Design a protein around this ligand. Structure first.
Ligand SMILES: [Mg+2]
Ligand SMILES: [Mg+2]
Ligand SMILES: [Mg+2]
Ligand SMILES: [Mg+2]
Ligand SMILES: [Mg+2]
Ligand SMILES: [Mg+2]
Ligand SMILES: [Mg+2]
Ligand SMILES: [Mg+2]
Ligand SMILES: [Mg+2]
Ligand SMILES: [Mg+2]
Ligand SMILES: [Mg+2]
Ligand SMILES: [Mg+2]
Ligand SMILES: [Mg+2]
Ligand SMILES: [Mg+2]
Lengths: 110, 50, 142, 184, 103, 142, 66
RNA sequence: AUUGACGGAAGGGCACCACC
RNA sequence: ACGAGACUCUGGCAUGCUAACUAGUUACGCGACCCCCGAGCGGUCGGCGUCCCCCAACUUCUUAGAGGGACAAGUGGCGUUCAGCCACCCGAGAUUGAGCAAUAACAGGUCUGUGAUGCCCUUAGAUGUCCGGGGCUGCACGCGCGCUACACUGACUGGCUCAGCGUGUGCCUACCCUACGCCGGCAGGCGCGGGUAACCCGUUGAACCCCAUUCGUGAUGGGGAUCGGGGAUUGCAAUUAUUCCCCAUGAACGAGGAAUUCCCAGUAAGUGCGGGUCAUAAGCUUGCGUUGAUUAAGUCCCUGCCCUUUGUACACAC
């Protein structure tokens, strides 16, 4: 797997500013303006729930209302429950969804 | 409480007579509902010449 | 005696463009072959030497109603934009073409910077445009 | 000496039909340099019979809604059609136009009373009908075809003025008279 | 001595013109070079609304409008003389704005 | 006036480029090449725009293929290209006749294996750009 | 199926019977001889340059020869 | 017997929200 | 007597009056440029000045006040010699366009405009109110208002030349219109100045149109739906794509059945520009100018209204 030429481990190492050049214009503008306390707390909880799971099983699901949180490369592998208005749909974050938002993985209709 | 930003949009603006948010007239700095304008027009000075 | 007003402008522009292209002193940007002259065009200009024609046209447009800038220059060269299935609207021309053209003319010593703001025509620009107008008016009566 | 478009004389035309003499306005007072004037001819009744016939032909060519209001275009296509006529025939284009009006006008129509009883046709209305038939013949001949509207207008009213049946207006006139004769 | 400019604004022509007449006459009586009434283009403020309070009917509209008229008077005289030229029974719908050669 | 080596039809990129058509609009029959890209390609090469496709010989055809296959080498700007900042490769380039179909297929399957919203709406066969589906789009559906 | 470029027979016909038309214009030479309008304009401009035919009028929409 | 409304009654007039 | 008309606003006229550096014109002086023999009460100038008070006057154009002006007044004809109608002269104009708009009504619409309101319901696990997310936009289909088109009376590229309404920095209220200079191919970005406005944007360099080039009757360089990739802007947040820009893909559509709408003079139609909505934004509406017609000066056939006569077992109107 590669994302705009660069591999996953380098994507993990680089800062937000270097990461901005590998995104689309929408995600670069969203990272140019800050990330508020909601997204920082979501990243905190995702990090905490990934660093406490035993080996060879998925991390515990982390529910969230934030459907507009872009998927950083420190979110891959982790399990998220995204609200769709009524329920928390489970999304296993796979490395291909770096660019996309969390919102377009929990459908809000039928 | 009143945490959500209300710096623009229909939520920010309300009529200066009834505090209704629909049909608002903002031209010339009125900030009045269309019906309230239609009622107070003669008092404000908006004659209906043509 | 002849002046720029006393001659067909559509042929005066071709004469001035041929003059500018003749004397190899106009500066051309490297992207001339790859750009549309406005966001409302569909293709690039059909004329390879479009830069000389645009420079001559704005030299004429600075002889009369002098004192202009890149904004007014992109409202002179703006046109109609067809928005697909939506109605059409007036849209301005590209600013970089206009700025490069005016700076190239400034490098030719024809155009200079006005006092209040904008760009006007030097006495040398007046002299050159009037001599070109004399040439086209003379070549019309033969 | 007022010449249409600067080159077409107007005192040697001949309206050979007495009925249409005072509706095809082309000479002595009606001479003009161009088929364009701020008209005010639709103000009162019959005032459009005092309009030059080339300006009526120009007016009736601004049609189908993509050419509405575009009068300068119709003025130049009339100018170019007249030059084509003078090349093809070898006679004054105003004469050819006047003869096309006279030949292409229907002189007996059929109105709906009910079955359609035959009726006679006014001179002004048959001038109107002649102009409209020539214009629509030219218009439908130039649509989806490599010929231009000037050549189609020229060949239309040339075939009209000569009287042949390959024009569209002569076909329509013959059809109108044929029904209005079979249904008297 | 200054270039004092009096600007008069009103919504009706009658009282505005009569206040202008009073000012010009008072200034002419005391021998002033009075550059007389300049008339700026009247501003028409227009608001077109729907007539109905609900949204049902025949879609008729209501065209309210308000005109604003503006007049100018230029005096060339000391301040204390304009302080008695003015202050003579200004009509209600008229509003004056003295500008004493500076903002 | 016709040259005896007039190629009536071309086979440039496993596609049939119709001769008897103007060269700038001839190569437009290749998928991935449109009017603006064809004009900038033919302008970077020394090919006269006022030519019917069949009038060219093999040298100009090979040069046209080389310039359109490798646009960045011949100073065609990055913003011109179809596939800028590729998701997987990361390389700026222009996808041609068969590459644009493999790339469109690979794009839809990327967005569909991931179960994104746009990919699901492509799989179901609906509009994916926010359009109202209530009254339009009924042709392609039973 | 208009010819984009003249062959020998059509070029012979254009040189041997087009300068004897009362009306010459790019829409009647491109219909008697089956050629495209662009080839017609090119051919008539070449004939005018050589001097066989005379220009009556020149417009951006209609050009007329003799 | 009177006023209104109606008549798949009988006469007049009007309207490019009717026609020609 | 009310309604109609009169009335009010608006359009058209005034070389007559009142005036104007927040509008100009014309002279004069200075300056630039062009011809020239030596040339000139020569030509172009939205270049500058006459606002230090004469070292220039004036109001034609612009603005807006007061008056004037049109009344079927004059001349023929018809008409009961009546009201009036038709034509014509002189005229700016011989029917400019709207606003207001009666007696009675309608179970017409609005309790979702209101600190207009009766009654009923609910009132702390609230139908109050706030916050987070979703939805109004969902898609086999059936209608209505529209926008773009089907091309050559055209599309594309370049060149040249013209508008009129009117808006603009805000109590709470954050959010204005923008000239000029420099980056960028574009959307855009960064500096810096003017404007609370006849002062600045702005002489609002609008589009159609006009002039030249390419194409050539082909679903084509007509049409631009659908869709892939990228770049910016607004926002606290753009995915179910806000909007804008660039490359690419290139569908139906070849003038539309039965039916049906709207309209008679600067009108229909074409074509753009403002206002409202608006942090972001018009395929909508409301106004504005621009190019500018075909047909008609009639009728009761169709669709509806109004009057009169006539029949009624109808009066909550069969
Ligand atoms: Mg323009
Ligand atoms: Mg044609
Ligand atoms: Mg659908
Ligand atoms: Mg009809
Ligand atoms: Mg009800
Ligand atoms: Mg109510
Ligand atoms: Mg909520
Ligand atoms: Mg809705
Ligand atoms: Mg409706
Ligand atoms: Mg196109
Ligand atoms: Mg195509
Ligand atoms: Mg708007
Ligand atoms: Mg709406
Ligand atoms: Mg109807």
């Amino acid at each position: 797997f590669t994302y705009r030429g660069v591999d996953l481990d380098q994507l993990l190492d680089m800062s937000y500013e270097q990461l901005m050049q590998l995104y689309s214009a929408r995600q670069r503008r969203r990272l140019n303006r800050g990330l508020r306390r909601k997204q920082h707390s979501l990243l905190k909880r995702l990090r905490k729930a990934k660093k406490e799971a035993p080996p060879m099983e998925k991390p515990e699901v982390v529910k969230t209302h934030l459907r507009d949180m872009i998927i950083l490369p420190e979110m891959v592998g982790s399990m998220v429950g995204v609200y769709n208005g009524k329920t928390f749909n489970q999304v296993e974050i796979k490395p291909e969804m770096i660019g996309h938002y969390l919102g377009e993985f929990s459908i809000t209709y039928k | 409480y009143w945490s959500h930003p209300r710096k623009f949009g229909q939520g920010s603006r309300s009529c200066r007579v009834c505090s209704n948010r629909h049909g608002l007239i903002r031209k010339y700095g009125l900030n009045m509902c269309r019906q309230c304008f239609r009622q107070y027009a003669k008092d404000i000075g908006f004659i209906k010449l043509d | 005696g002849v002046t720029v007003k006393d001659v067909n402008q559509q042929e005066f522009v071709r004469a001035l463009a041929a003059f500018l292209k003749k004397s190899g002193k106009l500066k051309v940007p490297e992207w001339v072959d790859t750009v549309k002259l406005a966001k409302h065009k569909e293709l690039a200009p059909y004329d390879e030497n479009w830069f000389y024609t645009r420079a001559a046209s704005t030299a004429r447009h600075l002889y009369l109603r002098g004192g202009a800038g890149v904004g007014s220059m992109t409202k002179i060269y703006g046109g109609r934009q067809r928005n697909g299935v939506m109605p059409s609207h007036f849209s301005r021309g590209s600013k970089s073409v206009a700025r490069r053209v005016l700076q190239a003319l400034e490098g030719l010593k024809m155009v200079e910077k006005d006092q209040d703001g904008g760009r006007k025509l030097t006495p040398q620009g007046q002299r050159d445009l009037d001599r070109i107008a004399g040439q086209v008016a003379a070549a019309n009566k033969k | 000496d007022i010449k249409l478009f600067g080159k077409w004389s107007t005192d040697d035309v001949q309206i050979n039909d007495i009925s249409l003499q005072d509706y095809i306005a082309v000479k002595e007072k009606y001479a003009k340099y161009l088929p364009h004037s701020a008209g005010r001819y639709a103000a009162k009744r019959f005032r459009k019979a005092q309009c030059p016939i080339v300006e009526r032909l120009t007016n009736s060519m601004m049609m189908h809604g993509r050419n509405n209001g575009k009068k300068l275009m119709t003025v130049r296509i009339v100018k170019h059609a007249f030059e084509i006529i003078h090349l093809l025939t070898g006679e004054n284009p105003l004469q050819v136009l006047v003869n096309a009006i006279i030949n292409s006008g229907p002189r007996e129509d059929s109105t709906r009373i009910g079955r359609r009883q035959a009726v006679d046709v006014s001179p002004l209305r048959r001038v109107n009908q002649a102009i409209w038939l020539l214009c629509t013949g030219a218009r439908e001949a130039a649509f989806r075809n490599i010929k231009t509207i000037a050549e189609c207008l020229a060949d239309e009213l040339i075939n009209a003025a000569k009287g042949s049946s390959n024009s569209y207006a002569i076909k329509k006139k013959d059809e109108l008279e044929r029904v209005a004769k079979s249904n008297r | 001595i200054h270039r004092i400019r009096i600007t008069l604004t009103s919504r009706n022509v009658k009282s505005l013109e009569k206040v202008c007449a009073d000012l010009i006459r008072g200034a002419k009586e005391k021998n002033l070079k009075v550059k007389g009434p300049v008339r700026m283009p009247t501003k028409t403020l227009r608001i077109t609304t729907r007539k109905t309070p609900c949204g049902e009917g025949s879609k008729t509209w209501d065209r309210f409008q308000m005109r604003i008229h503006k007049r100018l008077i230029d005096l060339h005289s000391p301040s204390e003389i304009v302080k008695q030229i003015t202050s003579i029974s200004i009509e209600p719908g008229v509003e004056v704005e003295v500008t004493i050669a500076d903002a | 006036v016709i040259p005896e080596k007039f190629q009536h039809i071309l086979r440039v990129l496993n596609t049939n480029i119709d001769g008897r058509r103007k060269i700038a609009f001839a190569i437009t029959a290749i998928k991935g090449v449109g009017r603006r890209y064809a004009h900038v390609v033919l302008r970077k090469a020394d090919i006269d725009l006022t030519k019917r496709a069949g009038e060219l010989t093999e040298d100009e055809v090979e040069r046209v293929i080389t310039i359109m296959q490798n646009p960045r080498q011949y100073k065609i700007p990055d913003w011109f290209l179809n596939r800028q900042k590729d998701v997987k490769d990361g390389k700026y380039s222009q996808v041609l006749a068969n590459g644009l179909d493999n790339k469109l297929r690979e794009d839809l399957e990327r967005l569909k294996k991931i179960r994104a919203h746009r990919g699901l709406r492509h799989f179901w066969g609906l509009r994916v750009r926010g359009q109202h589906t209530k009254t339009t789009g009924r042709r392609g559906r039973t | 199926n208009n010819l984009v470029l003249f062959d020998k027979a059509t070029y012979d016909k254009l040189c041997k019977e087009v300068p004897n038309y009362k009306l010459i214009t790019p829409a009647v030479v491109s219909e008697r001889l089956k050629i495209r309008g662009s080839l017609a304009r090119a051919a008539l401009q070449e004939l005018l340059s050589k001097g066989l035919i005379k220009l009556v009028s020149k417009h951006r929409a209609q050009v007329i020869y003799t």
